[PDB]
Amino acid sequence: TVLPGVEAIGLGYNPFISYASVNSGAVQLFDWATAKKREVPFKAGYFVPEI
Amino acid sequence: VDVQQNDSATYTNVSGNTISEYQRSLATSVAIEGRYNFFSGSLSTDFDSN
């Protein structure tokens, strides 16, 4: 499974419209459905892009 | 299609309550007597308003 929040990082963003929210900022820029995935060391069964 | 998680909730509640009460009372009384060695007279008047 993907780690929750990996869809939100890399989101194109506007800093002026509002404070930290997914509703400030447009669309995901990165193909992280397809990148090489590493398991996160402190949660077994959860993966993120190696980057 | 780019879908972002956005799990959120907001709640608002405004309520106002009011009571107003007014009360009035008025009472009046009059008593009169008249006297003459061969005549006696009495009158009473009473009025009440709420």
User: In oligomeric terms, what are we looking at?
Assistant: part of a larger assembly
Beta content of chain A comes to 5-15%
Structural class of chain A: little secondary structure
Q: Helicity level of chain A, as a percent range?
A: under 10%
Could you spell the SSE succession of chain A in H and E letters? EE
Characterize the largest beta sheet of chain A: strand count, sense, and whether it forms a barrel: 2 strands, antiparallel
Radius of gyration of chain A: 13 Å
How many helices of chain A? The count is 0
Question: Which pair of chains has the greatest number of interface residues, and how are they split between the two chains?
Answer: A-B, 8 and 5 residues
Q: Count the E strands of chain A.
A: 2
Q: What's the overall geometry of chain A? A: elongated
Instruction: Provide the spatial order of strands within the biggest beta sheet of chain A.
Output: 1-2
Ends distance of chain A: 17 Å
PDB class: toxin
Keywords: Pore-forming protein, pore, oligomer, insecticidal, pesticide, toxin
Entry title: Mpf2Ba1 pore
Chains A, B: Mpf2Ba1
Q: Mind explaining what this structure looks like?
A:
With 51 residues, chain A is largely without helices or strands. The two termini of chain A are 17 Å apart. Chain A is elongated. Chain A has no helices and two strands. In chain A, β1 (37-39) and β2 form a beta hairpin. The first copy, chain A, has a two-stranded antiparallel ribbon. The relative contact order of chain A is 0.30. The A-B interface holds A 4, 7-8, 11, 22-23, 27-28 and B 2-6. The PDB classes it as toxin. Keywords: Pore-forming protein, pore, oligomer, insecticidal, pesticide, toxin. The entry is titled "Mpf2Ba1 pore".
